[PDB]
Amino acid sequence: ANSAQAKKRARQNVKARKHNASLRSMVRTYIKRTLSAIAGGDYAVATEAYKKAVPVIDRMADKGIIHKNKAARHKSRLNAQVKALA
Template identity: 45%
Template sequence: MANTPQARKRIRRNERRADINGNRISRIRTFVKRVESAIEGGDKAAATDALRAAQPELDRGVAKGVLHRNAASRKLSRLTKRISAL
């Protein structure tokens, strides 16, 4: 258990940050799922619109440090490739 006031404060802060980061990751996953469901439905226009909405979310996740930039780039690339194949 934490013995110093600073260590106790870090525990509190880490719990708050974990909640915030979890919400960010969940939001990103939701946007990606919307793109994937549009792709599965075969609707190219809806998939393109969903991808346009998902791209800033992925970029924001990279900027906030919850997602590696190569992972975000890879996700965008793969989704774009799947949409263009429709």
């Protein structure tokens, strides 16, 4: 059943899967570190993590790895939780 174009589609699918997985893992790592700082509870340390995390989220949202609505939700909620610290 397979044809040349179908096989080509499958190979491209594999490559894209690996690339997108790496970038999305980067996003999650930064968000997790920001949450860890919030748990630590120091206002300055938490805001520094927030500043260092926001650009990566914006970049991958622009690339389309995640949706811009999800990026905005993350930024809003993280900023609120950082502000509640102090």
